Design a protein around this ligand. Structure first.
Ligand SMILES: NCCN[C@H]1CC[C@H](CC(=O)N[C@H]2Cc3cccc(C(=O)O)c3O[B-]2(O)O)CC1
Ligand SMILES: [Zn+2]
Ligand SMILES: [Zn+2]
Length: 234
């Protein structure tokens, strides 16, 4: 890929997607769109069900995520949560709905989805003033702990911690510590980006593996480095 990590030992190719185990019950899914840009999301095994964070870029790619789950985990997918209304995170909604999978997004992501050319999720998350999801709107999310950090990469971007692990997912908000820019800022809130990145760090203070949309997993320095680049936008 031109944007995105390269394939590495421990990675499994399945169709045109790549899967990597990060923990006993957690995998990263990676899909590509043309050069090629990689996009990452997560798959979590929770008891007798599977939870998905983010679609792939397309419906066909997202169907392949479901196929890989069937082969390698062989448990039903109970729900998916998508972290904002752009193609890399929500482009494959139709595959989930075709399969009868309950889908969740920030209410604002669902409201923006038609303007962004995305299919809205079936259910909407809302958030307290401190950024934590209102639990009534996140039914049976199990280990997925959803946090809205504030506007940054987009106004609707949300983040997800995996309870019982050292993993937190920053989506497109967080860039890795070797990044030379903040990526695609076309819909970004440059005034609040830096504070939102720091808020993500403070919401998951013990996470040591930070998973991101367009880089391999990094340490907590990714959060600080992102916030310090965002400081220069103001
Ligand atoms: C406006 C709405 C956005 C689209 C472009 C688009 O679909 N962009 C997604 C793909 C992409 C590519 C490179 C870097 C990043 C990043 O995350 O920085 C990235 O992520 B996004 O979610 O922004 C054009 C009109
Ligand atoms: Zn985006
Ligand atoms: Zn992105």
């Amino acid at each position: 890929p031109t944007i995105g990590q390269q394939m590495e030992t421990g990675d499994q190719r399945f169709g045109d997607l790549v899967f990597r185990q990060l923990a006993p019950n957690v995998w990263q899914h990676t899909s590509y769109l043309d050069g090629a840009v990689a996009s990452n999301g997560l798959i979590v095994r929770d008891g007798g069900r599977v939870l998905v964070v983010d679609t792939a870029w397309t419906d066909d790619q997202t169907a392949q995520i479901l196929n890989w789950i069937k082969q390698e985990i062989n448990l039903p997918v109970a729900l998916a949560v998508v972290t904002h209304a752009h193609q890399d995170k929500m482009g494959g909604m139709d595959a989930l709905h075709a399969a009868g999978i309950a889908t969740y997004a920030n209410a604002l992501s669902n409201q923006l989805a038609p303007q962004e050319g995305m299919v809205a999720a079936q259910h909407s998350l809302t958030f307290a003033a401190n950024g934590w999801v209102e639990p009534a709107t996140a039914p049976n999310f199990g280990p997925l702990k959803v946090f809205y950090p504030g506007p940054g990469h987009t106004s609707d971007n949300i983040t997800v911690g995996i309870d019982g692990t050292d993993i937190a997912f920053g989506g497109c908000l967080i860039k890795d510590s070797k990044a030379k820019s903040l990526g695609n800022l076309g819909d970004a809130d440059t005034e609040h980006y830096a504070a939102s990145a720091r808020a993500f760090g403070a919401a998951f203070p013990k996470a040591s593996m930070i998973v991101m949309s367009h880089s391999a997993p990094d340490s907590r320095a990714a959060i600080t480095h992102t916030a310090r680049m965002a400081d220069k936008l103001r």
